[PDB]
Structure formats: C-alpha cells, structure tokens
Write an enzyme that holds these catalytic residues in place. Structure first.
Site, PDB file in Angstrom:
ATOM      1  N   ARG A 132       0.771  -1.336  -0.380  1.00 25.50           N
ATOM      2  CA  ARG A 132       0.254  -0.073   0.174  1.00 25.50           C
ATOM      3  C   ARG A 132       0.465   1.198   0.441  1.00 25.50           C
ATOM      4  O   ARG A 132       2.322   1.113  -0.054  1.00 25.50           O
ATOM      5  CB  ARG A 132      -1.454  -0.241   1.649  1.00 25.50           C
ATOM      6  N   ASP A 150     -20.703  10.003   3.739  1.00 25.47           N
ATOM      7  CA  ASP A 150     -19.750   9.338   4.830  1.00 25.47           C
ATOM      8  C   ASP A 150     -21.244  10.040   5.918  1.00 25.47           C
ATOM      9  O   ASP A 150     -22.603   9.365   6.515  1.00 25.47           O
ATOM     10  CB  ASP A 150     -19.602   9.296   5.916  1.00 25.47           C
ATOM     11  N   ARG A 157     -25.209   8.819   5.144  1.00 29.01           N
ATOM     12  CA  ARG A 157     -25.372   8.005   6.202  1.00 29.01           C
ATOM     13  C   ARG A 157     -25.774   7.867   7.108  1.00 29.01           C
ATOM     14  O   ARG A 157     -26.528   7.403   7.971  1.00 29.01           O
ATOM     15  CB  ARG A 157     -23.866   6.628   5.902  1.00 29.01           C
ATOM     16  N   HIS A 189     -11.581  12.192   5.343  1.00 26.60           N
ATOM     17  CA  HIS A 189     -13.011  10.516   4.957  1.00 26.60           C
ATOM     18  C   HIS A 189     -12.394   9.981   4.963  1.00 26.60           C
ATOM     19  O   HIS A 189     -10.605   8.752   4.993  1.00 26.60           O
ATOM     20  CB  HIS A 189     -13.026  10.966   3.135  1.00 26.60           C
TER      21      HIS A 189
HETATM   22  C1  LIG Z   1      -6.356   1.444 -13.897  1.00 22.49           C
HETATM   23  O1  LIG Z   1      -6.178   1.762 -14.848  1.00 22.49           O
HETATM   24  C2  LIG Z   1      -7.520   2.404 -14.802  1.00 22.49           C
HETATM   25  C3  LIG Z   1      -8.367   2.405 -14.748  1.00 22.49           C
HETATM   26  C4  LIG Z   1      -9.818   2.887 -15.421  1.00 22.49           C
HETATM   27  O2  LIG Z   1     -10.867   1.964 -14.314  1.00 22.49           O
HETATM   28  C5  LIG Z   1     -11.354   3.053 -12.821  1.00 22.49           C
HETATM   29  C6  LIG Z   1     -12.232   1.813 -12.699  1.00 22.49           C
HETATM   30  O3  LIG Z   1     -12.989   0.640 -13.691  1.00 22.49           O
HETATM   31  C7  LIG Z   1     -12.003   1.172 -11.612  1.00 22.49           C
HETATM   32  O4  LIG Z   1     -11.548   2.186 -10.109  1.00 22.49           O
HETATM   33  C8  LIG Z   1     -13.192   0.129 -10.424  1.00 22.49           C
HETATM   34  O5  LIG Z   1     -13.832  -0.543 -11.683  1.00 22.49           O
HETATM   35  C9  LIG Z   1     -14.048   0.276  -9.361  1.00 22.49           C
HETATM   36  O6  LIG Z   1     -14.600  -0.439  -9.530  1.00 22.49           O
HETATM   37  C10 LIG Z   1     -14.053   1.773  -8.587  1.00 22.49           C
HETATM   38  O7  LIG Z   1     -13.530   2.046  -7.755  1.00 22.49           O
HETATM   39  C11 LIG Z   1     -14.380   3.399  -7.013  1.00 22.49           C
HETATM   40  C12 LIG Z   1     -13.987   4.503  -7.904  1.00 22.49           C
HETATM   41  C13 LIG Z   1     -14.320   5.798  -7.136  1.00 22.49           C
HETATM   42  F1  LIG Z   1     -14.650   7.216  -7.539  1.00 22.49           F
HETATM   43  C14 LIG Z   1     -15.021   5.671  -5.486  1.00 22.49           C
HETATM   44  C15 LIG Z   1     -15.620   4.135  -5.028  1.00 22.49           C
HETATM   45  C16 LIG Z   1     -15.756   4.470  -4.063  1.00 22.49           C
HETATM   46  C17 LIG Z   1     -15.923   5.083  -2.847  1.00 22.49           C
HETATM   47  C18 LIG Z   1     -16.316   4.901  -1.677  1.00 22.49           C
HETATM   48  C19 LIG Z   1     -17.406   4.585  -1.131  1.00 22.49           C
HETATM   49  C20 LIG Z   1     -17.766   3.823   0.037  1.00 22.49           C
HETATM   50  O8  LIG Z   1     -17.877   5.248   1.036  1.00 22.49           O
HETATM   51  O9  LIG Z   1     -18.737   3.752   0.049  1.00 22.49           O
HETATM   52  C21 LIG Z   1     -17.404   2.804  -1.872  1.00 22.49           C
HETATM   53  N1  LIG Z   1     -16.299   3.229  -3.017  1.00 22.49           N
HETATM   54  C22 LIG Z   1     -14.924   2.847  -6.005  1.00 22.49           C
HETATM   55  C23 LIG Z   1      -9.529   4.054 -15.808  1.00 22.49           C
HETATM   56 CL1  LIG Z   1     -11.214   5.113 -16.496  1.00 22.49          CL
HETATM   57  C24 LIG Z   1      -8.212   4.837 -16.301  1.00 22.49           C
HETATM   58  C25 LIG Z   1      -7.429   3.679 -16.049  1.00 22.49           C
HETATM   59  N2  LIG Z   1      -5.599   4.021 -16.431  1.00 22.49           N
HETATM   60  C26 LIG Z   1      -5.847   4.848 -17.438  1.00 22.49           C
HETATM   61  O10 LIG Z   1      -5.748   5.569 -17.807  1.00 22.49           O
HETATM   62  C27 LIG Z   1      -4.077   4.774 -18.021  1.00 22.49           C
HETATM   63  S1  LIG Z   1      -2.818   5.160 -17.378  1.00 22.49           S
HETATM   64  C28 LIG Z   1      -2.321   4.501 -16.337  1.00 22.49           C
HETATM   65  C29 LIG Z   1      -1.987   4.171 -15.271  1.00 22.49           C
HETATM   66  C30 LIG Z   1      -1.013   3.419 -14.088  1.00 22.49           C
HETATM   67  C31 LIG Z   1      -1.775   1.695 -13.810  1.00 22.49           C
HETATM   68  C32 LIG Z   1      -1.602   1.098 -13.327  1.00 22.49           C
HETATM   69  O11 LIG Z   1      -0.708   0.797 -12.342  1.00 22.49           O
HETATM   70  O12 LIG Z   1      -2.579  -0.162 -13.004  1.00 22.49           O
HETATM   71  C33 LIG Z   1      -2.461   1.679 -15.181  1.00 22.49           C
HETATM   72  N3  LIG Z   1      -3.182   2.493 -15.738  1.00 22.49           N
END
Ligand SMILES: COc1cc(OC[C@@H](O)[C@@H](O)[C@H](O)[C@H](O)COc2cc(F)cc(-c3ccc(C(=O)O)cn3)c2)c(Cl)cc1NC(=O)CSc1ccc(C(=O)O)cn1
Ligand SMILES: COc1cc(OC[C@@H](O)[C@@H](O)[C@H](O)[C@H](O)COc2cc(F)cc(-c3ccc(C(=O)O)cn3)c2)c(Cl)cc1NC(=O)CSc1ccc(C(=O)O)cn1
Ligand SMILES: COc1cc(OC[C@@H](O)[C@@H](O)[C@H](O)[C@H](O)COc2cc(F)cc(-c3ccc(C(=O)O)cn3)c2)c(Cl)cc1NC(=O)CSc1ccc(C(=O)O)cn1
Ligand SMILES: COc1cc(OC[C@@H](O)[C@@H](O)[C@H](O)[C@H](O)COc2cc(F)cc(-c3ccc(C(=O)O)cn3)c2)c(Cl)cc1NC(=O)CSc1ccc(C(=O)O)cn1
Lengths: 327, 325, 328, 331
Positions: A101, A161, A164, A188
C-alpha cells in the site's frame, strides 16, 4: 432521394457544442451509478464516458443509449480517446487501480498522471469532481496535475458518509433523513470527525438535550453510529463486493448543485489551507457552498479544541503522505 | 465582523454569468403559467420577468421567490428595464394589447419590446405566444433581425395537445398514446391532418375512411371544431385560459433547453417549403433543439390540405402587408 | 363497427377506484396554485375540484384537462356536488368568505365549513384534511371539531410557508440557498408567530452562538426584522398583485408530498397541541410535526425560552377566546 | 428518558401499511437496475427486494438505504422470506437460472419453471391482488408460466416482452432520421427475440407514414436496408453482452416505464406480452407482445394492429412454437 430527405427538410446547418455536458471517467460500478443517477436527474444535455477497458466502455454506452426513449439527455458518447469529453462543464473521476500500500496510492497517482492532463486538454474550464479513493489525497493530486484554481477541484469527500449518518440518525429517531441534520467532516474514512454539536431536528440540539451524546459514557452509544458510518462501506463490500448506489446518488446530488448553481452547502473536500488552523496544501471536508463555479465559500464550523486538533492532525498526515508521491 | 463573515469564509470573487436563463415577457395569467410550469420543470438556473405594470410585476416576482425552498431555480429577477433579461438563452413573449387595428397595437408593443430583448440577449431564441401568434411571430422575426431558426411561435402546439386529449377521451387511452396533428394557421383555419391520426401506428382513417368528413357518423370533424372553440369556451367560463397554454410552452422550453430535437407542431418561417412563397409563419412538424427549429417534417398532404395551407399563407401575408415597423 | 371498438379490443370491465386521489376545495387563485403544483409533482392519480361558482369551476377543470398530454395525472374531475370528491386520501380546504368585522368574518367562514366539512367527511371518511383558509389556526380547529376526525388527520398549513419565507430571506442575507439555511417560525400564524432564534443555523452552526445579539433589539444587523419581513411579506405581495398564490401553492404541495409518500418529514404546521408546550386549551398552533400517510404522528418538542413559551400561551388564550365565541 | 422521547412526542400508535409498494424479485444486475430506476422516479412508497443469495440481498438493500437522503421512497426492505413483500401493488420477476455447458435450452427453461414454482406461490400468498410483471427470459414462456401458477386473471399477468426492443428500434430510428426517439414511432410485436415482428406499416414521424413515402421499407429490395435496423434490435442484447457481459440499464428503464403506467393508472399503450388467445387469429394459450393499454388493473385493452398476411403468419407460427414448448414443461 434518401427516406430521411424525403421525410425531413434541413433548414439549419449547425454545429455540436454541448451546453451542459458531463463526463464520467471510469465505467466501473461507481462510475455507472453516477451515470444513471445523473441521467435520471436530467442534469446534462450530453453525457460522455471514458475508460481504458474499451469493450466494457462501449457496452455501457450502448446499454445507456438503448434507454434514450426514457431519458431526456439526447447525446451519450464514449471513447478511450479524451476528445469525446470536450467542453464538459463537469468531469467526474472514478478511476483507480485495485488492491502493498502507499504503492497503491502511487499507482493511482500514475493513473491520474495520464487522465488529468487529458481531461484538462479538452475541457480547460470544467469543474473537476474526484471520487476515487483515497479521495482527499487523489483530489489534491488532480489539483496539482491539472493546474486548476482550487475552487474548481472538488472531492466527494464526506458527502456520502454524512448522508449515511443522517439516515442512521433517521432510523434512531423515527424521522426521514431529510429532517435529520448532522455533519461528518475532515478526513474521509476512519478519521472523519462527527460534529456532535451540530446534530439536530428542527433546530433542536441533540447534544444539548443529551450532554453525554457521542461520549463513551453515552448510555445510548451514539458514538457507535459514527463508527457504523465508517464501517458501512466495509460492511457493504463484504456483502455484495463493492458499493454503488448510494455513492452514485450522492455524486449526482453534488452535480445538481454545480449544474444548477444552487449554492447549497455540502460536506465535501476542498483545498483549505488558511482556514481551520490548517497551513498545508491539503483537502479536507468542511461545509462548502457549491455552485456553477465550484466551491466559492466555506462555512466556518465552531469546533471544540479537540475537534480542531483532530482536523490539524488529518492535515499533517495527509501532507505527510503527499510528500512521498512522485509527480 | 458581520455575522455572514463570521459564518462564511469567501474563497472566490464570484462572477454571476447566467448559464441557462429564461425570460418571460408579460406577467399576465399566461406569462405566469409559463413561469410556474418552467420553474417546476427545472429548466432554468435563472428566471427573469418583465412587464410595464411594475407593482404587478414586483408582486409576482416576490410570490415566486417565496417558494424558493421548494424549487431548484436559484435566481428569480424582474423589472421594467430589460437589463434584467440579459444573457437569456430563451425569451418568451406573452405581451399583448388591451382591447380591428389590434395587431397594429400589438405590433407597436413589439416595436418596443423586441429590440429591447435583442439588445440584452443578442443570442437568445425567441418564443412568441401572443395572439395572433403567426402574425406576431413574423413581426418579432422581422424586428429582431434574427435568423429564422431562432424565432418560434407557439402556433398549434396547444391545439394539438387539445386534439390528442379529446382523441384520448373518445378512445379511452392516454393522450400520450393518441397521435394527431393540427397544422397551419393557428385558430379557426387550422388543418386537422386526418391521415396521420393513429394509436400504435394504426391509421384511424384507414380503419374508418369517413374520418373527418360530413358523412362521418361519429362526427370526428366536430373534434377539430371543439379544439378550435375550446379556448373561447374556457374564456367564457373562467375569463381566460392559462394552465394548458402554460404547460405546452414549458414543453417547448424543455426541448430547447435540453436540445432534445423532438418534433412539435409549432409556427416557423416556412417560405420555400409546402409550396409557400411568402415570408409567413405556419405550424408544421418542426425539430426543436438548442438552435431553435433546425429541420421540418414534410407532411404528405391531400391536394386540398395543400391548398388550405397556401391559402393561409396568402391570408397572413395579406394582413402583414398592412402593418408597419 | 364503432371506430374505438374497431381499433381497441376490450378485455376488462371497469372497477375504477382511485388509489391516490386528492381533492382541492376552492378554485380561487390559492386553490388552483395548489392544484397546478400538485399536478406537476405527480402526487395524485386523480384530482377533484369543488367550488360553488360553477362556471369558474368547470372552466378551471377544462383548462387543466387540456394540459393532460403534459401531465401524469390521468383523471381530473370537478363538480358542485361532493360525490366527485369521494375516496380522497387528502382533501385540501382553501374556501373562504369574501371593515366590519373580524369575529363576524370568522363566523361566516365557520358557516362555510359547516356546509363544506360534513360534505367532505361523508364522501371521504378516511381522508386527511389540510386547511389553508385564514385564519388557518382557527379554521383548522373548526374543521377538526366539525369533522369529528382524530387530531392526527386534521392539519393546518399554519406557519409552513412563513418558515419557507424566513429561510429564503436568511439565504439572501447569507448568500446560500434556502435549502441550506435553517430556521423555524412556530405558534399562531401571522404576526403573533414566533421566530425560534436558537435553532437558526447553517450546517449545524448556531447563528445565535456566533451572534448572541441575534433577534434582540440590541442587534446592529437587525435580524429581528427578518421575522417582521416574513410577517409583512404576505400583505406586501397582496398590496402589489392583489393576492398571493404561487408560494402557498408550492408550500401545500410540499405537505401533500410528505402525506402521499409517507415521508415522515418534519414541517412547521398547525396541530392540536393541547397538552404540549404548556398549552391547556383545545388550540391549534404550529410546531414541528412529523408528517406522513396518517397525518401528524409525532411532534418535535422544541426547547423554548420562557418568553417564547409565554408567547404561545398568549396565542392559545386568544384563539381559545375567539373559538369560545363561535356558533357551530 | 431516551433522547428520542426527550426530543419527540408520539401522538399516534402506527400500524404501517404500504400504499404503493413495489417488489422486485431477484437482485441481479437487471433487478437492481429496475430497482434504482423505480426509486428515482418515485413510483413506490415502499420497495422490497427478495432473492436466495442472502448476503448479496442484504448488501444491495443497505446500499440503497444509504441513499435515502436523496430519495423520496421512505421504506426499503429485503429478505429471503416473502413476508417482506406483503401488500405489493406490483411484483416484478427478474429471477432466473443461468445455463451451464451443457444443458439444453429446454432444460434451462424447465429449471426456470422450477424457480417460478417456488416464487410465484409465495408472491401470490402475500400479495393476492398484485399485478405480476415478468422480465425473466424466455419472457413470453415464463410469463405464461407465472400466469398458470399464480391463478391470476390474465389482465394482471404482464410480460415485458417487446417493450425494450421497441425502444431500441425507435432509438435506432431516431439516429438514422436525426430526431429524438420520442418523436420516432415504430412497433416490434409478437414473440420476444429473433422471431419478433417489425411492423413497417406503422412506422412514422409526426404521422407521416415512412412505408408510404418509401414502399420498399423493410423489404429485401430496400436499398436503404431498413430491415437491418430490425436485425440490429434483435442482436443488440447479444452485442451488449459481448461487450459488458450482460445488459441492465436499458431494460431497467423500460421496466420502470411500465411500472409508471401501472402505478399511476396512465392507460398508455405499450408493446408488452399479454395472453392473446382469441385475438390476432391466435387459437392457443400463449403470450405475445401487442400494443396494450396498461393501467392500475394491468392490461385492460389491446389495440388491434392491422397486419399483413405474412405478419399474421409469423405470429400464428410463434404461437404454435410457444405452445409446443409449453406442453413440454413440468408444472
Ligand atoms: C487501472 O487503470 C485505469 C482504470 C480506469 O478504471 C477505473 C474503474 O474502472 C476502477 O476504479 C474500478 O472499476 C473500481 O471498481 C472503482 O473504484 C472506486 C472508484 C471511485 F471513484 C469511488 C469508489 C468508492 C468510494 C466510496 C465508497 C463508500 O464510501 O462506500 C465506495 N467506493 C470506488 C480508468 Cl478510467 C483509467 C485507468 N488508467 C488509464 O487511464 C491508463 S494510465 C495507467 C497508469 C497506471 C496503471 C496501473 O498501475 O494500474 C494503469 N493505468
Ligand atoms: C399593452 O402594453 C404592454 C403590455 C404588457 O403586458 C403583457 C400581459 O400583461 C398581457 O398581454 C395580458 O396578461 C394578456 O391577458 C395575456 O394574453 C395572452 C398572451 C399570450 F401570449 C397568449 C394568450 C393565449 C394563447 C392561446 C390561448 C388558447 O388557445 O387557449 C389563450 N391565450 C393570451 C407588456 Cl410586457 C408590455 C406592453 N407594452 C410595452 O412594452 C409598452 S410599448 C406599447 C406600445 C403600444 C401600446 C398600445 O397600443 O396599447 C402599449 N404599449
Ligand atoms: C363564499 O362561500 C364559498 C366559497 C368557496 O370558494 C373558495 C375560493 O374560491 C375563495 O376563498 C377565493 O378563491 C379566495 O380568494 C382564496 O383565498 C384564500 C384561501 C386560502 F385557503 C388561503 C389563502 C392564503 C393563505 C396564506 C397567504 C399568505 O400567507 O401569503 C395568502 N393567502 C387565501 C367555496 Cl369552495 C365554498 C363556499 N361556500 C359554500 O360551500 C356554500 S356554504 C356558505 C356559507 C356561508 C357563506 C357566506 O358567509 O358568504 C357562503 N357559503
Ligand atoms: C437460481 O434460482 C434463483 C435465482 C434467483 O435469481 C435472482 C438473480 O440473482 C438472477 O436472475 C441473475 O441476477 C440473472 O443473471 C439476471 O438475468 C436476467 C433476468 C431478467 F429478468 C431479465 C434479463 C434480461 C432481459 C432482457 C435483456 C435484453 O433484451 O437486453 C437482457 N436481460 C436477465 C432468485 Cl430470486 C431465486 C432463485 N430460486 C429460488 O427461489 C429457489 S427455487 C429454485 C428452483 C430451481 C433452481 C435451479 O434449477 O437452479 C434454483 N432455485
């Protein structure tokens, strides 16, 4: 002559430009919950989706489009290429890497290093709303990379939150959450600050009726309500694998305040250096006035010295994490 | 410091540039019905009201402002001065003269209002509702200097909604599911396009070839008659009409503000189409969106339906030839 | 043979019973404002209007009906006979009597309710009654006494609009939406109403704690004047356009929403509060009430100063005195 | 004194009974899409969810509940025990078994019948007066199944049938014509899926017949190939499933639209599946999509679309086929 030309005579030859365009980046469960919530609130005249998973992206766009008859948002587009996002009023970031992490934060930072420059390229004037976790840190990251003025970079923060909290409060009191008032502020997550002094129904201070409110000596254990808030994401992920609907609804409510310039007050993370005794470039949730220009004003909540120090501690830990990031 | 400043720290120097502003000109029963309908549909982030009766005007504004808590339109303004209307996306004209030579006095009214409107909202769409609506929409257009796509008359929009309502009572289904088009010149000379009336794609005329004729035992022709009279009947009963016209105008505002490109029976400058050769406005099925009317459906008319529209064109042009601006 | 029968095959006979019917009594400007607001918030599947001016009534009904295409309330009816109102979940009373004299004015409104309320109850035994007619606190008492309904099912719009005005003005001074400004006006509707300064807040931040002078005559900002502004605004608008309509309409639609959807939101509305707030008499005053499908089920007990508590006691005596003199 | 009693004085003992309760059976992606759509259109004062996966069920309920601040449906309840569905006006069936490798499509259908044999009696028991809206596939067959098991009169058993496909058709129509789907009119009738009937004769904008403007409309000799628009409609579910692995949002929106007509007694006309024995020249007990008047008593009337001889042939053929499969099922 084509049927379309037999049927319809074109009198005007016109161009493009959307007037209330919203983009959602990331079409995971959270992104799509934001999308359908926004579509069903009639907040946009054009909705753009973007992701890197191109099939998934195209399939979500098509599924939404098939529901056009039932919506009042005439254009829904998608693409891996950010030109599809041009001239958005508001861009909502739900993209992230998934579970080390701190190395998780850096991977999200690297994701943002690609996304944010692209977003700002095609929408230099948009508001940025970051939802990705950790949201206070990632919102700071979007802010630094984008070069935007702080009023235009917003984090979903403690908005869900607090909602909630109010729901749970409503459960305890037998009244709708709409009529129950209370604020969770600051960082948060587990370190968020429940402001017991602000909790009320119809202007009636609960803490005043019930001085032990929120303390360990509270026979009614209201302190546990806050912990239940903090745990609920964890509990729901445990049950269904993720959360979507509530966060989606909460994000759509922020979008409404922005797109309609309502200037309602929401508990969202804003760059608050210079306020609340904070001296670092960090984003924390405080009550913010939210409108067509993003966050223009902040409510200064009277805190206990214990609440103040807790807020300053979050700033310092947030800053401590931000120093280890590579931009 | 002031309580506001103790309570609230300002972080931004706020420019108020309205984004989705709508103006209603004329705060009579029609204007105010358009206003509340628009406010309840959340179509604007700012509403402006203008009239020459300043007390009435201020009172209506205040009454709307007082319901702010129950609305999602954060700014409501008014005044006799058109600076209050600045930067409207859409401006709705319900202004009219108090009771021929009326159209002339309405024209005189428009000679003052329109340039004032255009001065403060150079890029707005104009929606004329004042009667006689096809004529005044022509006047608004000429005076405004606007290209024709940006000037719209409510035309037969309401009468069509009335027709469909009456269709639905006769058939026992909601007006939404009954389809029918009243076109041409607004009023007694409007054209019930019998051939297009249908439920679920089923032609009523094909089921019932006598539809709309004197020999029709069900007397469907009287339905158009009833639409053309209904306003007169409502005025007779309550003194004026408001709610229905107000709802129909909010429906058009919706297509405009959300760029829906729905088709509505509204009045457009149709010189060049339908065999018409004069600068006149008549209702045809128009595609309505953020740029006003951008396309019109070319309805297949009978030779006499065709001749009837051409007659209205010459009728309107004849009246327009007298007017002076 | 008939066209309808040629087009449409009928499979089911009529059992037409209204599920979420609302009646508005009185089609004056207030009545129709309630009606249009209710229609555009989709709170009812049938709307009924009653009045004694039969031309005006029919005319208002038709105008609404002509708007059907743009509504999702499939049945609008009206009549002078109350059979059109039968099986209403909610019946809204806006009927009223048209410089001498106050008590004599009230009595003629009582006289109207003596005719109206029984007719309503006959055809909708199980409805909630919502009174808007002025003076609303007294007329809500009369509707209650006449109807014989339990107190949970007779509601006066009371200080609901005035609280909404107060929040709007609060918002204008503070630069935020009224939705985010909280303040409560309670007690007797009108100039005897009580602004509860101690509950006024944004985001849970007490304005009185920030600004101890708030609402006293020792206030350089004169916030006390906001209450006065509220009190006066009705008559200012009346001075300007002759009457008021739009805000009270929206105000009533908001209450109807809580009832029809059983939201159990808290509104400042007029309820029979004998036995609370130190009130001993059968009097209706505005307090924060939990409002749902069974009307008023709970009351929030606001902590009032001794002055504030005295104000309500006084109004209770006023109202009770007047009611004492009414002929039922 | 508890803070609640300190703050709130109770004047009424509440015996809560829901007035506009909707139940969704099955909290898969389709079920939850219906659920969120219904909640955001304020169609119910109480929403109940049921399923056999208890963790999943509880998680979805809680997620929706956490959104209460932003909704106007005061009560969301869930449970595996059908007591939670009592007194629903509308019960929406999206439960289904998923295929294996493996099993035939008939054995997959029978396993769905097995599911309905458990669900439908439980639903009927707690909500004897509800309307049933069946969404599960194959929809015409499973709507027939729910009809037969529930014992409800036919007006109260409704299948989603061609509702969504007609919406897709109007959308695609609007894309070719440059007009919003709301102003494009066209009907897909009959058996849901491959064998559905695009009624070319009824397609129009503003009451202008496209078929009359363009007599080749929907023929093989059509140079504009409008038949491909029907094929597009027919393949769209599969196309979307290829890309995201299932569909949800559109079917959810289309279901809430039907919910709206029912809960508000609108008597709008929808292309939905109804027991049409005795109509459209059909002699069997089967469900086909035809334009139905939909209200508080369900389907009260059907519109009689004038069909060509080849259109009537397709429907009657679909009837035989459905009735054939139906006779092979174990109830
Ligand atoms: C992985 O890469 C990418 C992934 C992408 O997809 C994102 C999405 O699909 C995933 O986040 C997924 O679906 C998760 O479910 C969503 O998780 C979230 C997102 C969010 F906004 C809020 C919460 C959330 C908040 C509160 C609470 C609660 O309070 O309850 C619950 N949940 C949870 C995109 Cl669009 C571009 C790139 N990347 C690119 O553009 C290429 S550049 C790049 C650089 C490095 C890496 C690498 O190292 O991996 C990859 N790409
Ligand atoms: C009179 O002067 C003015 C009056 C104004 O007041 C406008 C308004 O309040 C009145 O129109 C009133 O509310 C009418 O009732 C509304 O009547 C309408 C309006 C409308 F759009 C549609 C319908 C309608 C349509 C269909 C149906 C149906 O189908 O059912 C029913 N109804 C009915 C204004 Cl803002 C400016 C000026 N003028 C000025 O700006 C000064 S310049 C000037 C020049 C000449 C003159 C003069 O010659 O008099 C006066 N002023
Ligand atoms: C005259 O009789 C009747 C009149 C009727 O018409 C009612 C209606 O049309 C008129 O009230 C008109 O529209 C008023 O203007 C509306 O005024 C109101 C009404 C209201 F509810 C609230 C407000 C209000 C509140 C707050 C604010 C603010 O805070 O801003 C502003 N405004 C204003 C009816 Cl349906 C029955 C009877 N009566 C009958 O049924 C016959 S029995 C009878 C007995 C005696 C008498 C007699 O004494 O005359 C008459 N009839
Ligand atoms: C597994 O059994 C059960 C499954 C259940 O599943 C609920 C839910 O989770 C699943 O439906 C899941 O989400 C599906 O994927 C959703 O798939 C659908 C459902 C639907 F309605 C429509 C569409 C659809 C339509 C159109 C389009 C398009 O056109 O685009 C796309 N999609 C797709 C329930 Cl609540 C009870 C039982 N069972 C019990 O009640 C016990 S009795 C029993 C009997 C036999 C068996 C057995 O044989 O297995 C099991 N149980």
């Amino acid at each position: 002559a084509a049927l379309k030309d037999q049927l319809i005579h074109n009198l005007l030859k016109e161009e493009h430009v959307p007037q209330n365009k919203i983009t959602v980046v990331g079409v995971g469960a959270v992104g799509m919950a934001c999308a359908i919530s926004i579509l069903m609130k009639d907040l946009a005249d054009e909705l753009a989706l973007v992701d890197v998973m191109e099939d998934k992206l195209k399939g979500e766009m098509m599924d939404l489009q098939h529901g056009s008859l039932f919506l009042r948002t005439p254009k829904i587009v998608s693409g891996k290429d950010y030109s599809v996002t041009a001239n958005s009023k508001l861009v909502i970031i739900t993209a992230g890497a998934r579970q080390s992490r701190l190395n998780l934060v850096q991977r999200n930072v690297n994701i943002f290093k690609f996304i944010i420059p692209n977003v700002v390229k095609y929408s230099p004037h948009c508001k940025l709303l970051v939802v990705s976790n950790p949201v206070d840190i990632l919102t700071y990251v979007a802010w630094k990379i984008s070069g935007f003025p702080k009023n235009r970079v917003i984090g979903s923060g403690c908005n869900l939150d607090s909602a909630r909290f109010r729901y749970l409060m409503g459960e305890r009191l037998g009244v709708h959450a709409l009529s129950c008032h209370g604020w969770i502020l600051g960082e948060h997550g587990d370190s968020s600050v429940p402001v017991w002094s602000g909790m009320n129904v119809a202007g009636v201070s609960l803490k005043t009726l019930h001085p032990e409110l929120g303390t360990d000596a509270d026979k009614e254990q209201w302190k546990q309500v806050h912990k239940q808030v903090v745990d609920s994401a964890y509990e729901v992920i445990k049950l269904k694998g993720y959360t979507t609907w509530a966060i989606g609804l909460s994000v759509a409510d922020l979008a409404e305040s922005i797109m309609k310039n309502l200037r309602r007050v929401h508990p969202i993370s804003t760059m608050l250096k210079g306020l609340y005794g904070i001296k670092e470039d960090v984003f924390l949730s405080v009550p913010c006035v939210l409108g067509q220009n993003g966050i223009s004003d902040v409510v200064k909540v009277t805190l206990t010295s214990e609440e103040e120090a807790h807020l300053k501690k979050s700033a310092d830990t947030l800053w401590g994490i931000q120093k280890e990031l590579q931009f």
